[PDB]
Amino acid sequence: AAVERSKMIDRNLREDGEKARRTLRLLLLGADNSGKSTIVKQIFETKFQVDKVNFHMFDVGRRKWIQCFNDVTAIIFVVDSSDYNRLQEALNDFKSIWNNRWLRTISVILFLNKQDLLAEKVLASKIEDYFPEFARYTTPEDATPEPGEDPRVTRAKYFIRKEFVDISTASGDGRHICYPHFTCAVDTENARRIFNDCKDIILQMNLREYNLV
Amino acid sequence: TASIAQARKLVEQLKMEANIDRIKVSKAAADLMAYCEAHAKEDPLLTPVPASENPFR
Amino acid sequence: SELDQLRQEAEQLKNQIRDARKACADATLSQITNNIDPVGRIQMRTRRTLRGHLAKIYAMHWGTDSRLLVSASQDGKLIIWDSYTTNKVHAIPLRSSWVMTCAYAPSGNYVACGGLDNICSIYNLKTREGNVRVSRELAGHTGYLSCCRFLDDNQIVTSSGDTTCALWDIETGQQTTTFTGHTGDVMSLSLAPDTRLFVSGACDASAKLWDVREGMCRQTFTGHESDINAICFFPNGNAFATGSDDATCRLFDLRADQELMTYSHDNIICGITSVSFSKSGRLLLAGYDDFNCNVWDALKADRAGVLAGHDNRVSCLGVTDDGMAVATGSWDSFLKIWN
Amino acid sequence: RLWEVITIAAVTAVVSLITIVGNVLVMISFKVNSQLKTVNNYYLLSLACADLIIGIFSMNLYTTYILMGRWALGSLACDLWLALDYVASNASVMNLLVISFDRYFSITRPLTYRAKRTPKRAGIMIGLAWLISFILWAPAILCWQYLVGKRTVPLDECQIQFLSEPTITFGTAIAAFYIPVSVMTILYCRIYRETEKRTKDLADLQRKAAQTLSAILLAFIITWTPYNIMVLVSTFCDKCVPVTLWHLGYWLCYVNSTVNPICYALCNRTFRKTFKMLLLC
Ligand SMILES: C[N+](C)(C)CC#CCOC1=NOCC1
């Protein structure tokens, strides 16, 4: 009698495990006043669906509970690109997350938030004072500014991305990949950017599944 | 006065730690040694029980 | 002025503690237990394997008897097992899947659950409805819950991630006594067999002994070099052992008020998740991060045996009240019961 | 001449033993490892079962037929062995086609397919593959002598009787090899395009696919092409194809079943780890 109750439980356990494996779990991280809550316009849990694929975002309101998110699909790291005093702190916060023991197979979806305030700051306040490496730095020739923006904005934006990808290419070596981006205050395409990056993460897991990449 | 009261309680907690009976280690280690020897017959892990008495197979 | 004088007085008081502990030291545990024969090779093997979970298993707790054990995983399921027959008595669903701790009542009528939701959920098992119902929720912690233990099926002591420990009342849902002595967040808690004293291990390399009635820190033990996330009492109740990420297990004595023995191996580098003692306390079992858990002689500091049966990180370890079996749960979907 | 047939028997015994222990290891590595009990590895168990049926029964009986120079086991045993061999070989190729479709769907649509990779779809694809193979070969082999009315195959030898009739031969070759190798080549080329594309897109936001992906296709093509060429040349030019060249083609088809585990199962690290565990014991 008790064996049949245990078998009836296993039917209910496998039914709940199919729905749990059918969604993607995401970890939302970032500093204070970086607009983590305004990334997606749809512990705290956030649910949104893109192309009939369910996503789950989790943020905790320090470095010990990161072991609970060992099996997430990606980590959404949000950086305030407007201010420069906390930008070095955000670079060190990303370096500890990237070079973590329990985060080696977990890709990071980087969100350089507040790019409209970054564009307003560089057109007026000196990025060279907070970063000596911005001097003697040139924009690469294979650069495509999308909205007809100023080259001073594009050089500033490419420098902030560069500092966040030399950290990612120093370690990992293809196990997990940082996927940079840029976000305004009223950008509504962040749900597609997470969907396209989680498309690449599962694809890279499938290519390692078949020993192709 | 919250910091003054918490510092006063931390001093009183250190006074309670100082006013304790500190039995010597050689008397303390002999107590755990004698307790391990007296209960060694009743330990099923130190002394392996036969499979008839053991309910796990 | 006044704050600097109090800090200098506290530094002089801390120097008096170290000088009293150095004067109290006369011999080591290895010198006393040099004539004691070793336990030999341990041939402990897996008897039962519990394959009903679906995610990483973070905690487990035995019952009063050696039959029923609760288990908590990251799939939002709190499965109560029957270890004799590898059955499933209950399959309790949780509101939050982020669960780091679970507990079993000594009476067996209740279980506890907690994690990143900052809420200690008590579930009643002996109900007339035929299903497990949520009895009470304790939401007085501002940090993540890491451990919880029942005292007498009405009071539960919980250790949280906001550097605090609290004594609860189930029938009222209020914090009876709050223990605020740690600077780092507390990741482990154990109860002494007389259910009156308990030591909590936090991440500031410090284990502090507390009283459930006085509400004051009786002793502070600072011997570890890294963060502590594992603690357990000796069966005598006059000593306790800790497990840190420094690959070191340290046995602290309450009466001697300092460290007795360091169960460290130079081959072991990775951290320790969970520690527990045997029935007599001579075997100390520690769960490591090298996919296995080792058995340590508590009086000789020798690696007695390796319980290599897991292909992932072992996170919880429990020994029954009569010491018949040891069940280790890991980050796979399996609990393995040994002997 | 005795040393030649001893060498042939030794080589065929070594390759039959290799494929038997390989498919047995793939079954044991699925059974004892619950991490390998996924939806996509059911296809590999199907493939392993087909290759074990090929390695146990088909290779040894074939070799004995070549070495003795005659069947000498009855016409019914010849027909049953031919039906089992052709059904198992086509089931293996159908399993390769289904694995290629699964890889293509999980690579080009890595998120949409994850909700359609249920165990019921994998079971119905495996059942459809085996049913297509059985329907394609078993009534054609076992019942051609009753449809014609005469058994034109001599009693001492063992050969499919319809291999002389041009139509059924081309039909059962384009339904068994040419359309599957064409679909597999197209799907794996699209897979290569997707890998190159992701690497470029990632570099626009911020190889190993040349060896493995081109060693799967060539290990299939080299080991299945000469039989499917010599059957289509033998259906017209009666005695063009030599006898030893024919036997070598027939055998090579089995060689593919030997090298099947290494190209599909062993690619997955969890299998390599389980095999390194299993071998030593
Ligand atoms: C001739 N042999 C039995 C060795 C292999 C065969 C066959 C027929 O089916 C297939 N041909 O190639 C693809 C499947």
Numbering used by the authors:
A (entry chain A): 18 to 59, 207 to 225, 231 to 254, 265 to 303, 306 to 394
B (entry chain G): 6 to 62
C (entry chain B): 2 to 340
D (entry chain R): 26 to 231, 438 to 512
Question: What does the published report state?
Answer:
The M5 muscarinic acetylcholine receptor (mAChR) belongs to the class A G protein-coupled receptor (GPCR) family. As one of five mAChR subtypes (M1-M5), it responds to the endogenous neurotransmitter acetylcholine (ACh). Despite its low expression levels in the central nervous system (CNS), the M5 mAChR plays crucial roles, primarily localizing to dopamine-containing neurons in the substantia pars nigra and ventral tegmental areas. The development of selective M5 mAChR activators faces significant challenges, primarily due to the highly conserved orthosteric acetylcholine binding site shared across all five mAChR subtypes.
Here, we present a 2.8 Å cryo-electron microscopy structure of the M5 mAChR complexed with heterotrimeric Gq protein and the agonist iperoxo, completing the active-state structural characterization of the mAChR family. Prior to cryo-EM analysis, we incubated the iperoxo-bound M5 mAChR-mGαq complex with 10 µM ML380 overnight on ice, followed by freezing and imaging using single-particle cryo-transmission electron microscopy (TEM) on a Titan Krios microscope. The resulting structure achieved a global resolution of 2.8 Å, providing sufficient EM density maps to position the receptor and mGαqβ1γ2 complex. The iperoxo-bound M5 mAChR-mGαq complex revealed iperoxo bound to the canonical mAChR orthosteric binding site, which is characterized by several key aromatic residues. Residue N4596.52 forms hydrogen bonds with iperoxo, while D1103.32 engages in a charge-charge interaction with iperoxo’s quaternary nitrogen. Relative to the inactive state, tiotropium bound M5 mAChR, there is an 8.1 Å outward movement of transmembrane 6 (TM6) and 4.4 Å inward movement of TM7. In line with our mutagenesis results, no cryo-EM density was observed for ML380 in the ECV allosteric site or in the EH4 binding pocket.
